[PDB]
């Protein structure tokens, strides 16, 4: 009526457990080899005698007269890096200045080009991720920039995280303090005329916390031109003003120590040519600015909760509309589950008291190369850093229909959103508990 | 129809609870003794009269006319050390230099050999675990190295955690800062010509966060030869260059205080003979380098979520294909569960501001013995340390079939992946609640 028979052993009734597990010493040796914990074979047999493979011949038979089903809970555990190549978090296109030249007697010829910089897999934490990006902009300048004109003064594109506008005085037209108040509010990207960044093929966008208000329109390009209204205002010549006590004030600090120009639009304007995203969003025209088509969001280092799909092709019936095949990247799905990664949050009031000390701690100002320029400076570390953290996930799918004849060797397969094994799985295993559902 | 009888007590109907528990004062005295919380006996009787053993005679009878089953939830609690012998986290083979000699008139005879160093069980935290490893490399040099030639200058194999390549200038061919920027990014292992490490029999690999892209091929050996492209570049002679203001620059610091050689390949090259894994992974040939067959992963101190299997040989029916036996290491399994250990993550911006202070705090530079050599130095402590932490696990297995005659003494057994009691169990106990499933 509801048996469960196996080769030659006492028949069992009503229910039991078949175990899908990678570890088994025997099968690892033989079976999987060129496989990994995301696409492997395993014997469900569990009987000490019998050579695996020869096991493959045997079968667990759930009484034929009834349609069976089984509860499937699984234990999935990864250890995927915040920033890696497979997830698309190690690359990102941006347009920078390539050459600054003296041409055809009087012309200033500026040549800009798009280029894709890559990051060294792993390096978690958001802030640091920013830094690694800024550094990659530089590392490039080091291989092309300088040796083709282009000064530091005109480095296009830099990810910062502050509100260049806190000091700002509605009359002066300047950041009175003479310094862009060094506190971190949200990541944003700053651009110089003519350049900009593109994330079309990268989840890092999600790391900065900047998304399109219309996601499905593939094409994340944020040009200098887009950051309308909201160019970082200029600094008051704190020195002049004070010593001068008319009043100098109108004097908007044009350079800095080591004399770098703050590219001011004209000898008059209080604004600089440096455009900030964060500004355009909440300080620019809400109806036509950038706030119109992009959204200011919480960072999230994981870069985006993605899901993984399970499949047990040789043991569960194929769900409603999937068709059975043998193409690993199209197997039927039997369970979906978010990919095991969380955002742990910490507190480091030590940030920026630490950037200050961190710089001495790290024997180099590698990230802060321009410790004077109020722009190109090293963005403030924000209190509350986030870090992707891997965690085992004791998930639980529902009862799923089973085949009344379970093969000795079952194939287990965890796929990702785009349907492809996921290299970062360290442990995957599931427990199935069959039971009756109705009869034929 | 569905009774539940016991010796001479009123019959009970429909369900109840049998308790599997180690603690009981009586049985501990008699029964288990030479056993432990992972393989013990216990009386299910729970009746104050009756000498255990004499209890063993009695039996709980679930009505014969029906096939019963019972819900089995358990409470498991361990306290296993991050690094211990049983889990294979206290040993690890590496190949180091044994002797440096002056031979047959003009020959420099270098003799290398493999050797297995061990760690002192317990010592959690990842960073510190690294240190303990590096220290073991040393401790060996202290017993063989020096007293056979081999200087410190040529110590093969050292686990570090930084990106020897941040300063790097694409033109100079040197780390301009004159110092390998002291910040921690990911663990990696550095090697000198001729040596290397092997983890074939160790989970520490998983601690460093370096795994094979093809797990099942038993054999984790990472030779110097493998770390192709990606030898730690050399340091700019910061002193020369500056004082000299042609420009010295090309000058790649050959030694350091206490004069140790940075083994530079030749009087010309800017590269040193020191090869870094982390470099090869993201800085070397992606198609043939190491990134081809190894994967950069999140650390994880637990060394690898492993599972444990339960078994109640004398109380549950043997699941589908297991056969009943009396060999403790083959009992049928009735429930699987991950071994109770998590990765708690913390923030210590105090790292490297602390290594700096930690060294004075610890009255010795035991781990930093070479505070000058930019390589052999003590790796930076990474912000965000991890620590294996034991936690009670209130798990829940499903309803499992029962025998209609439950013996007075049941045997409980928790096994591990390889099937062997697990010494680190402090408390294990379960509650079973039988109930009808169908009739005969």
């Amino acid at each position: 009526r509801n048996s469960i028979r196996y080769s030659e052993l006492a028949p069992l009734f009503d229910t039991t457990r078949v175990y899908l597990v990678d570890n088994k010493s025997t099968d690892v040796a033989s079976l999987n080899y060129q496989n990994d914990h995301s696409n492997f074979l395993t014997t469900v047999i569990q009987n000490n005698d019998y050579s695996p493979g020869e096991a493959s011949t045997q079968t667990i038979n759930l009484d034929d007269r009834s349609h069976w089903g089984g509860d499937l809970k699984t234990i999935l555990h990864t250890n995927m890096p915040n920033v890696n190549e497979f997830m698309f978090t190690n690359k990102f296109k941006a347009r920078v200045m390539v050459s600054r030249s003296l041409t055809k007697d009087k012309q200033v010829e500026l040549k800009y080009e798009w280029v894709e910089f890559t990051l060294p897999e792993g390096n978690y934490s958001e802030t640091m991720t920013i830094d690694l990006m800024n550094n990659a902009i530089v590392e490039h300048y080091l291989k092309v920039g300088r040796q083709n004109g282009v000064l530091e003064s005109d480095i296009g594109v830099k990810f910062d995280t502050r509100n260049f506008r806190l000091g700002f005085d509605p009359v002066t037209g300047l950041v009175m303090p003479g310094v862009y108040t060094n506190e971190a509010f949200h990541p944003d990207i700053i651009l110089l005329p003519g350049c900009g960044v593109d994330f079309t093929h990268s989840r890092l966008s999600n790391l900065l916390g900047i998304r399109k208000r219309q996601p499905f329109q593939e094409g994340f390009r944020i040009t200098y031109d887009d950051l309308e209204g909201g160019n970082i205002p200029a600094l008051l010549d704190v020195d002049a003003y004070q010593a001068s006590l008319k009043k100098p004030v109108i004097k908007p600090l044009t350079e800095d120590s080591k004399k770098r120009s703050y590219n001011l639009i004209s000898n008059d304007s209080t604004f600089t040519q440096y455009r900030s995203w964060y500004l355009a969003y909440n300080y620019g025209d809400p109806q036509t600015g950038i706030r119109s088509w992009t959204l200011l969001c919480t960072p999230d280092v994981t870069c985006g909760s993605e899901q993984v799909y399970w499949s047990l092709p040789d043991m569960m019936q194929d769900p409603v509309t999937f068709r059975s095949t043998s193409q690993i990247s199209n197997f039927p799905v039997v369970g979906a589950e978010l990919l095991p990664v969380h955002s742990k949050s910490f507190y480091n009031d030590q940030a920026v008291y630490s950037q200050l000390i961190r710089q001495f701690t790290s024997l180099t100002h590698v990230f802060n190369r321009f410790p004077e320029n109020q722009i190109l400076a090293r963005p403030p570390a924000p209190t509350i850093t986030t870090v992707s953290e891997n965690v085992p996930a004791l998930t639980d799918h529902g009862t799923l229909p089973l085949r009344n004849s379970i093969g000795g060797v079952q194939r287990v397969t965890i796929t990702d959103a785009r349907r492809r094994t996921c290299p970062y799985v360290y442990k995957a295993l599931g427990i199935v508990s069959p039971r009756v559902l109705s009869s034929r | 129809r569905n009774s539940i009888r016991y010796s001479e007590l009123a019959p009970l109907f429909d369900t109840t609870r049998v308790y599997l528990v180690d603690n009981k004062s009586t049985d501990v005295a008699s029964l288990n003794y030479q056993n432990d919380h992972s393989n013990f006996l216990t009386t299910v009787i729970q009746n104050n009269d009756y000498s255990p053993g004499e209890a063993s005679t009695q039996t709980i009878n679930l009505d014969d006319r029906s096939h019963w089953g019972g819900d089995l939830k358990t409470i498991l609690h361990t306290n296993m050390p991050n690094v211990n012998e049983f889990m294979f986290t206290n040993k690890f083979k590496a190949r180091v230099m044994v002797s440096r000699s002056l031979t047959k008139d003009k020959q420099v005879e270098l003799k290398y050999e493999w050797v297995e160093f061990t760690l002192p069980e317990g010592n959690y935290s990842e960073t510190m675990t690294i240190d303990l490893m590096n220290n073991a490399i040393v401790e060996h040099y202290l017993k063989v190295g020096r007293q056979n030639g081999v200087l410190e200058s040529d110590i093969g194999v050292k686990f570090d955690t930084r990106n020897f390549r941040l300063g790097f200038d694409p033109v100079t061919g040197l780390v301009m800062p004159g110092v390998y920027t002291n910040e921690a990014f990911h663990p990696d292992i550095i090697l000198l010509p001729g040596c290397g490490v092997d983890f074939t029999h160790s989970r520490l690999s998983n601690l460093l966060g370096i795994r094979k892209r093809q797990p099942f091929q038993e054999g984790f050996r990472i030779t110097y030869d493998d770390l192709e492209g990606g030898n730690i570049p050399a340091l700019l002679d910061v002193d020369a260059y500056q004082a000299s203001l042609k420009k010295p620059v090309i000058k790649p610091l050959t030694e350091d205080s206490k004069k140790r050689s940075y083994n530079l390949i030749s009087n010309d090259s800017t590269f040193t003979q020191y090869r870094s894994w982390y470099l090869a992974y993201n800085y070397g040939d992606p198609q043939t380098g190491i990134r081809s067959w190894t994967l950069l992963c999140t650390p994880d101190v637990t060394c690898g979520s492993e599972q444990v299997y339960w078994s109640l040989p004398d109380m549950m029916q043997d699941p589908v294909t297991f056969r009943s036996t009396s060999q403790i290491s083959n009992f049928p399994v009735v429930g699987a569960e991950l071994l109770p250990v998590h990765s708690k993550s913390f923030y210590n911006d105090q790292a490297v501001y602390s290594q700096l202070i930690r060294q004075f705090t610890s009255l010795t530079h035991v781990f930093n013995r070479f505070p000058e050599n930019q390589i052999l130095a003590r790796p930076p402590a990474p912000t965000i340390t991890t620590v294996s932490e034991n936690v009670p696990a209130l798990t829940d297995h499903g309803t499992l079939p029962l025998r209609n005659s439950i013996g007075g003494v049941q045997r409980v057994t928790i096994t591990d992946a390889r099937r062997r009691t697990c010494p680190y169990v402090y408390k294990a106990l379960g509650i079973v609640s039988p109930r009808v499933l169908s009739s005969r």
């Binding site: 530089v138 300048y141 080091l142 300088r146 530091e152 080591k258 100002h365 190369r369 321009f370 410790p371 004077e372 | 300063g167 200038d169 100079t172 301009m176 800062p177 910061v238 500056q242 420009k247 620059v249």
Partner: peptide, 10 residues
């Protein structure tokens, strides 16, 4: 005429 792009002073 070479920019090391690094503030050696401080």
């Amino acid at each position: 005429t070479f920019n090391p792009v690094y503030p050696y002073d401080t």
